[PDB]
């Protein structure tokens, strides 16, 4: 009951019904295969009562991490998909539900501070646009830190985590863009939002923090224009 790729150890939602491939010879890139193809298990988020949620930006989260992060910040062009596995370790006495959703071209927004003519420029800071490996917390999860409502987020590729039912979720995301290749540093293709729809609840004498865990595997990566 386990599977291993490249000395890394550890149902499936296939986004838009297409399996990520390589681009053809047209329409000489470097293909690292299992060197950069492995399981990156990033840090663990403690999920609490009264927690709003978290989000990531996927070409961004691995920019500082490991071998994939080396190639990313040095090759000029980038293409790849991802296989993303979100696990939650809880007990039969905890209850709650998580909505794991993959938002293509997820663009964070800023909120105007209540009373003001609101014409001046407001803008999300660089921490919210590129949260890095640590992810970022929703201040307003109901609108997804954008204008779109949460209740319709199910139109994106998603999966439910219901603690009484399965505790794991796996989403495979093909490369989606308007260009065959793009910049890994500047452009963020999508992001995960893990949103506790139904809040977390338990009884006294149990574990308060429930450890949501995120593990992401690049798929069919290819690079171009290697600098120093």
């Amino acid at each position: 009951a386990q599977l291993t790729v490249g000395n890394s150890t550890i149902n499936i939602v296939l986004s838009y019904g297409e399996w990520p491939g390589y681009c053809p010879s047209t329409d000489k890139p470097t293909r690292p295969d299992v060197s950069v193809n492995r399981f990156y298990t990033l840090s663990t988020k403690s999920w609490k009562t009264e927690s709003t949620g978290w989000y990531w930006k996927f070409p961004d989260v691995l920019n500082d991490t490991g071998v994939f992060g080396q190639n990313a910040q040095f090759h000029y062009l980038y293409r790849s998909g991802f296989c993303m596995h979100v696990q939650c370790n809880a007990s039969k006495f905890h209850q709650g539900a998580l909505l794991v959703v993959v938002i293509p071209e997820f663009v964070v927004a800023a909120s105007s501070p209540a009373t003001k003519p609101n014409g001046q420029g407001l803008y999300p800071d660089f921490a919210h646009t590129n949260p890095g490996k640590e992810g970022q917390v929703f201040r307003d999860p109901y609108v997804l830190d954008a204008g779109i409502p949460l209740s319709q987020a199910l139109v994106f590729p998603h999966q439910w985590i219901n603690l009484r039912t399965n505790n794991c979720a796996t989403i495979i995301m093909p490369y989606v863009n308007a260009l065959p290749f793009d910049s890994a540093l500047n452009h963020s293709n999508f992001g995960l939002a893990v949103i506790p729809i139904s809040p977390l609840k338990y009884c006294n004498g149990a574990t308060t923090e429930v450890p949501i865990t995120l593990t992401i595997a690049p798929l069919n990566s290819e690079f171009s224009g290697l600098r120093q």
């Binding site: 009951a1 386990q2 291993t4 490249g6 000395n7 890394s8 150890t9 550890i10 492995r38 399981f39 990156y40 298990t41 990033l42 840090s43 663990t44 403690s46 991490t65 490991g66 696990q87 370790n89 809880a90 007990s91 039969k92 006495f93 905890h94 490996k133 009884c203 006294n204 004498g205 149990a206 574990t207 923090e209 429930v210 450890p211 865990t213 593990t215």
Partner: protein, 132 residues
């Protein structure tokens, strides 16, 4: 271990080892540990994210009680070799009215290709007393 006692009667050995872990906590407990192997010539990983890099296995308490880790290409020949660290990946999740502290047991053994040569006499039995 029996391997560690039986390789102290020989001068040189080479081969692979395997190290099995077994979790004795309660059936209701869950969590994850990160079991990482560090090849020779490297120091002990400072933080988990440094250990998350190659040659690790993330191990879930709920799913499996036991897990195994193989150690390649060991040799002593000479005159820092290898390090296995166990990291907390998440946290130790527990329901009510169940113990919050558990134990892990480490087993180890040689594998098929392990070999020994040049038998010598062990230093553990010295025992200067002449009455024995």
């Amino acid at each position: 271990t029996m391997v560690g006692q039986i390789c102290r009667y020989y001068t040189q050995w080479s081969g692979s080892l395997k190290v099995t872990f077994m979790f004795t906590g309660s059936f209701m407990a869950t969590g994850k540990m990160l079991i990482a192997y560090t090849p020779p010539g490297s120091a002990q990983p400072t933080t988990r994210e440094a250990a998350m890099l190659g040659t690790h296995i993330v191990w879930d308490f709920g799913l499996q009680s036991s897990v195994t880790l193989v150690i390649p290409w060991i040799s002593n020949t000479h005159f820092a070799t290898g390090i296995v660290t166990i990291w907390y990946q998440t946290n130790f999740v527990v329901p009510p009215d169940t113990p919050s502290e558990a134990n892990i047991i480490a087993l180890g053994a040689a594998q098929e290709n392990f070999t020994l040569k040049l038998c010598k006499d062990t230093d553990e039995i010295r025992q200067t007393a002449e009455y024995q």
